[PDB]
């Protein structure tokens, strides 16, 4: 019944993933041992969406873990939930990607991907009725960017009609740890625009802005950033895991969200978000949940939506709430902000409403924006890339893996084609 196969790639993809497995296991009421310990029959009636049954009523996550170093497998497996995964689903190399896309895609991950794909085959054919693939990765560095997009290509060719849904942490100028991030990202976005059905664009600069200007965390870690990402990952699949007044499958999102085939690069958000010292003073009610959710400060890519227009927004609400109040607020937003929505679509907001809010919340909303403002994320990467590439800098590390200079010219060509298609409707 609408199974998902979930895949983690590189350090970032395994870290946002292994945090997500702590979140959806708390929702479904599963102990780190894999034993069920939840309150409610609604927690169990759809556990097959993300887990397999095993003997003794142990629940095993339908996750595949991929890296070219053992050290992130050792970091996930030694972690709080590290026991819960299947030991035979850890698939790894023994020398790193070197932060090189071409090592991921052509050499060190081209060796390994056949031993990933036969594990993906084992879990997918063992499903009753697969709906899609949920892949977590980063576009900087070499494992997530280059092996994860190799793996998207191989799974897309074998499962052409299932939803390919990716959560993609990607480079920005003011929060960067790699010299060659622009190269790796430009070579990787060239694969996402053709193969994925949805890609959720996520930014460490925007995840630090939520932590500093909304949560007021004094020292936000990567563990705090991974918690913001995984809340929106739990959010968008909610309607296949729990009952609701309006149900929306990942496909019911895609049909409403993606007007023209390639415009599927979204920007997620979440509500409520508060400091722990101000939750005492705020109402979680749908109007306050909405005023936050559409705030340029709340979204997880640094692109201000006020520098473009939404094509579509989806607001996936959770909790006991009025359909009049939800339909009132999603109307009031796009009429009072009408200059920020495209005027050739007569209603820009999809709504969905689940009956089961997150554990310890009375209400939640997960936001998905398909804003043309996302042209700024692809533009600034293309402008960082252009400066290094105009003088061929660092390219002996990529051409050493047998990659052409023509593939850099063609990837940045395809990047500007993606920028042009979002700018066209702006």
């Amino acid at each position: 019944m609408r199974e998902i196969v979930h895949i983690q790639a590189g350090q970032c993809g395994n870290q946002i993933g292994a945090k997500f497995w702590e979140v959806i296991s708390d929702e479904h009421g599963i102990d780190p041992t894999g034993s069920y310990h939840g309150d409610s029959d609604l927690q169990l009636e759809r556990i097959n969406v993300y887990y397999n049954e095993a003997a003794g009523n142990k629940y095993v996550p339908r996750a595949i873990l991929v890296d070219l170093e053992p050290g992130t497998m050792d970091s996930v497996r030694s972690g709080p939930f590290g026991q819960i995964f299947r030991p035979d689903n850890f698939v790894f190399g023994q020398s790193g990607a070197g932060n090189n896309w071409a090592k991921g895609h052509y050499t060190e991950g081209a060796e390994l991907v056949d031993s990933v794909l036969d594990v993906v085959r084992k879990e997918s054919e063992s499903c009753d009725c697969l709906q899609g693939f949920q892949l977590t990765h980063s576009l900087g560095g070499g494992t997530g960017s280059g092996m994860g997009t190799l793996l998207i290509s191989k799974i897309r060719e074998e499962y052409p009609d299932r939803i390919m849904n990716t959560f993609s942490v990607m480079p920005s100028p003011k929060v960067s740890d790699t010299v060659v991030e622009p190269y790796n990202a430009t070579l990787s976005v060239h694969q996402l625009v053709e193969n994925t059905d949805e890609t959720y664009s996520i930014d460490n600069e925007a995840l630090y802005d939520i932590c500093f200007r909304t949560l007021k965390l004094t020292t936000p870690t990567y563990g705090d950033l991974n918690h913001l990402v995984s809340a929106t990952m739990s959010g968008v699949t909610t309607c296949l895991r729990f009952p609701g007044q309006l149900n929306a499958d990942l496909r019911k999102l895609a049909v409403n969200m993606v007007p023209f085939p390639r415009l599927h690069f979204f920007m997620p958000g979440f509500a409520p978000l508060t400091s722990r010292g101000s939750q005492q003073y705020r109402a979680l009610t749908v109007p306050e949940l909405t005023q936050q959710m559409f705030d340029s400060k709340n979204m997880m890519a640094a692109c201000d939506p006020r520098h473009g227009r939404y094509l579509t927004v989806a607001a996936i609400f959770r909790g006991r709430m009025s359909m009049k109040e939800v339909d009132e607020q999603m109307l009031n937003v796009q009429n009072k902000n009408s200059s920020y929505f495209v005027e050739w679509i007569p209603n820009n907001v999809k709504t969905a409403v689940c009956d089961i809010p997150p554990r310890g919340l009375k209400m939640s909303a997960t936001f998905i924006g398909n804003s043309t403002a996302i042209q700024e994320l692809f533009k600034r990467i293309s402008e960082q890339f252009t400066a290094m590439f105009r003088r061929k800098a660092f390219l002996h590390w990529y051409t050493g893996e047998g990659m052409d200079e023509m593939e850099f010219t063609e990837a940045e060509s395809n990047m500007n084609d993606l920028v042009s298609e979002y700018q066209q409707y702006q």
């Binding site: 409403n256 085939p261 009049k324 209603n347 999809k350």
Partner: protein, 430 residues
């Protein structure tokens, strides 16, 4: 004798069903486990097994399991036959073409077979009651696949159809205009009387009459179910002037394609208001001609009335009803067509409206449901084909429909056929 097969398609049709069957069980005194403590009054809706258990004459169909698995787990799980609740594998995704061409094919030949295994238990099946959303993928595409089969397999039998239709401003989907326009062939060719209803109109009726500031869907479904009970009440009970399901149509429908009546109910009222006004036949009759009580956001004063069925129930008398419709003929703001000098079909039934005990709606000695063919409804079509035109001028979502086996020309052929219906309702007003 007098059976009605009830088909509930997609989330809206199933959830209105979960209020219709909540009501019909109370009104006939059937327990939620299907037993009856202590006459044929239940027979239109319930088959009776030799064990003394009643079973509903219904089919619930969804291409995704979630909403029907709620019915199979909640308090009505004992009522239904566990094969008359039908679930597919995969969602129709608000895409007409998944409902009609691609996913619907994997379940239609089971749905239609279970409908036939209900029909073989009837003795003079009176008609079908089909409940759906115009905006849904299952709602539009699966209902249109099913009606095409039912209109060759049961060609004589009257198919009445209850549709939740897109609003002026309230919407839940971007592609709601595409699914609705693609449905217009279904209602024109394979339906006999189609009751359009609007979420935004009932939300306003709830705010003004029921004093509920922020309603859910369960509130709306306890108003839509109340109409179908009141339509079927002459089929189920004794009255001064009982109306047959075919007699209703002979007075509602002036021309073969002009079978889209408005509907309204009175008194919709809060139990706190209902003490401070007397709610006479003349008051509840006049309430039906207010724009404030129409369940589609269009103004009847921008139209002309072709025919009205005033279906009264409870403590009403033909004296009072004639004296009431004489005041409606006197008012110059309520304008009938020149060619319908009679105008009114009256029904009167002795069974009061049942109260759902958890509902917002008062106990009242009397109600009327007014079902009304009027030229005004063409504005609800003129709203939505202007939403369609903005998106089809860009081909704005068309690759999802073409990608699932639909001809691209069906969008033009559906906007064309809607313009011919919107022409027909303007043409007969003159």
């Amino acid at each position: 004798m007098r059976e009605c097969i009830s088909i509930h398609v997609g989330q809206a049709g199933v959830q209105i069903g979960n209020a219709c069957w909540e009501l019909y069980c109370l009104e006939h005194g059937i327990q939620p486990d299907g037993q009856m403590p202590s006459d044929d009054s239940f027979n239109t809706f319930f088959s009776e097994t030799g064990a003394g258990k009643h079973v509903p004459r219904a089919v619930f169909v969804d291409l995704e399991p979630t909403v029907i698995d709620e019915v199979r787990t909640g308090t009505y799980r004992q009522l239904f036959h566990p094969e008359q609740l039908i679930t597919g594998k995969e969602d129709a995704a608000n895409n007409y073409a998944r409902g009609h061409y691609t996913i619907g094919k994997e379940i239609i030949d089971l749905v239609l077979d279970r409908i036939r295994k209900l029909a073989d238990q009837c003795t003079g099946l009176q008609g079908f009651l089909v409940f759906h959303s115009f905006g849904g993928g299952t709602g539009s595409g699966f209902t249109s696949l099913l009606m095409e089969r039912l209109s060759v397999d049961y060609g004589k039998k009257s198919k009445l159809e209850f549709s939740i239709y897109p609003a002026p401003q309230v919407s839940t989907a971007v592609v709601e205009p595409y699914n609705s326009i693609l449905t217009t062939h279904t209602t024109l060719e394979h339906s006999d009387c189609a009751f359009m209803v609007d979420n935004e109109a009932i939300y306003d009726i709830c705010r003004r009459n029921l004093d509920i500031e922020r309603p859910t869907y369960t509130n709306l479904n306890r108003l839509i179910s109340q109409i179908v009970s009141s339509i079927t009440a002459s089929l189920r009970f004794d009255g001064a002037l009982n109306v047959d399901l075919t007699e209703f149509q002979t007075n509602l429908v002036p021309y073969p394609r002009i079978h889209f009546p408005l509907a309204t109910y009175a008194p919709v009222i809060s139990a706190e208001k209902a003490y401070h006004e007397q709610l006479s036949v003349a008051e509840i009759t006049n309430a039906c001609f207010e724009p404030a009580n129409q369940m589609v956001k269009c103004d009847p004063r921008h139209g002309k009335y072709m025919a009205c069925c005033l279906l009264y129930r409870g403590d009403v008398v033909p004296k009072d009803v004639n004296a009431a419709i004489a005041t409606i003929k006197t008012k110059r703001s309520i304008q009938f067509v020149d060619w319908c000098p009679t105008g009114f079909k009256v029904g009167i039934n002795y069974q009061p409206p049942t109260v759902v005990p958890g509902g917002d709606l008062a106990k009242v000695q009397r109600a009327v449901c007014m079902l009304s063919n009027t030229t005004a409804i063409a504005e609800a079509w003129a709203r939505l084909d202007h939403k369609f035109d903005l998106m089809y001028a860009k081909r704005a979502f068309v690759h999802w429909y073409v990608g699932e086996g639909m001809e691209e020309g069906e969008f033009s052929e559906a906007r064309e056929d809607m313009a011919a219906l919107e022409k027909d309702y303007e043409e007969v007003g003159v």
